[PDB]
Amino acid sequence: PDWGYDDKNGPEQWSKLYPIANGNNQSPVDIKTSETKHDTSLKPISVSYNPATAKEIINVGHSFHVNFEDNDNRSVLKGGPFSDSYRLFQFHFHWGSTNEHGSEHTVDGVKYSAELHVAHWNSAKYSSLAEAASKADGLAVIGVLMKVGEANPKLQKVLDALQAIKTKGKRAPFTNFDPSTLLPSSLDFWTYPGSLTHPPLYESVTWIICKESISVSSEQLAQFRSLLSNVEGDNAVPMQHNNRPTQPLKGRTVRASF
């Protein structure tokens, strides 16, 4: 790939190959609570996922993805700022080199250890992820900040699956899992129009950032960093980090559901 998180192909250099990197709707961003607008037209977030839609876990070199079958509405996101139903298709994480950083979004300048992203595409208006991916209202991603602390038992199935996809390109069946079990108890959120946090960086994401964080232990984070970005047989290259720095709001307004 022509992009990554290293010095030469990293976030700071993405604009060379992907000009949109310097766009007006880029993510992640720093959420300044003193500037958020408490909107009353925002309904509660509603998620209903079918564990049978879980399909496969894949090492994609810079991270790993857990994909879901998206041929129907068995797993969907509704409510919040949406009028359309969004179909679940994947969830993944972002982490940093050390516990000091790792999340992509930040709140009042505070950086967390990792971040969970649960992605969905607008099946009410579009026919596929491919079509929806580049549409302004095509994607909806829930972001959950992960604060280093007690080990999180709900991450167990995901963590135990990593040993089967250690190197780039490896993939394995990952079934019977409901990602709503990874979300915090409260679904109060912030929302703003943004983009994918890595190439192609399409500004097609309506973000849903949870106010409440979830926990993750230092050892669990070590497991993410123990994944390898190289292909089997080559010198091991640990996946140390994959979080993009926060970008300028460019006048966008972050709304709060609380």
Residues belonging to the binding site for substrate are 197-198
User: Where would I find the beta strands (DSSP E) of the chain?
Assistant: 30-31, 37-38, 45-48, 54-59, 64-68, 76-79, 86-95, 106-107, 114-122, 139-148, 171-173, 189-194, 205-210, 214-216, 255-256
What amino acid is encoded at 33 in this protein? T
205's contact among Zn ion, ligand M28, none, with CB below 5 to 8 A by partner kind, is ligand M28
Residues 175-204 within binding reach of ligand M28 (CB under 6 A): 196-198
82, HSE (Cβ side, Cα atoms, 13 Å): 30
62 classed as catalytic: yes
Q: Which residue is nearest to Zn ion (CB)?
A: 117
- Residue number, 117 or 241, with CB nearest to ligand M28: 117
**Residue 110 beta carbon to Zn ion: minimum distance, rounded to whole angstroms:** 19
**Residue 156 beta carbon to ligand M28: minimum distance, rounded to whole angstroms:** 23
- Residue number, 141 or 209, with CB nearest to ligand M28: 141
CA distance between the termini of the chain: 41
Rounded CA-CA distance 173/186 in Å is 30
Nearest to 245 by CA among 206, 193, 197: 197
Binding-site residues from annotation: 62, 65, 92, 94, 117, 197-198
Asked if 205 touches ligand M28 (CB under 6 A), the answer is yes
- Residue number, 65 or 211, with CB nearest to ligand M28: 65
Rounded CA-CA distance 5/198 in Å is 9
Nearest to 147 by CA among 87, 214, 62: 214
Asked if 141 touches ligand M28 (CB under 6 A), the answer is yes
- Residue number, 160 or 250, with CB nearest to ligand M28: 250
Catalytic, out of 62, 105, 120, 241? 62
- Residue number, 151 or 231, with CB nearest to ligand M28: 231
The contact pattern for Zn ion, residues 86-125, with x = CB under 5 A and - = no contact, is -------------------------------x--------
Rounded CA-CA distance 192/36 in Å is 10
Q: What angle do CA 89, 51, 128 make, to 5 degrees?
A: 20
243's contact among ligand M28, Zn ion, none, with CB below 5 to 8 A by partner kind, is none
**Residue 41 beta carbon to Zn ion: minimum distance, rounded to whole angstroms:** 27
- Residue 64 and residue 92 in contact, taking contact as beta carbons nearer than 8 Å: yes
Residues 207-246 within binding reach of ligand M28 (CB under 6 A): none
Cβ contacts of residue 33 below 8 Å, gap of 6+?
107, 108, 256
- Residues binding ligand M28 (CB under 6 A): 117, 119, 141, 196-198, 205
The residues that touch Zn ion, with contacts defined as CB under 5 A, are 117
Residues annotated as part of the active site: 62
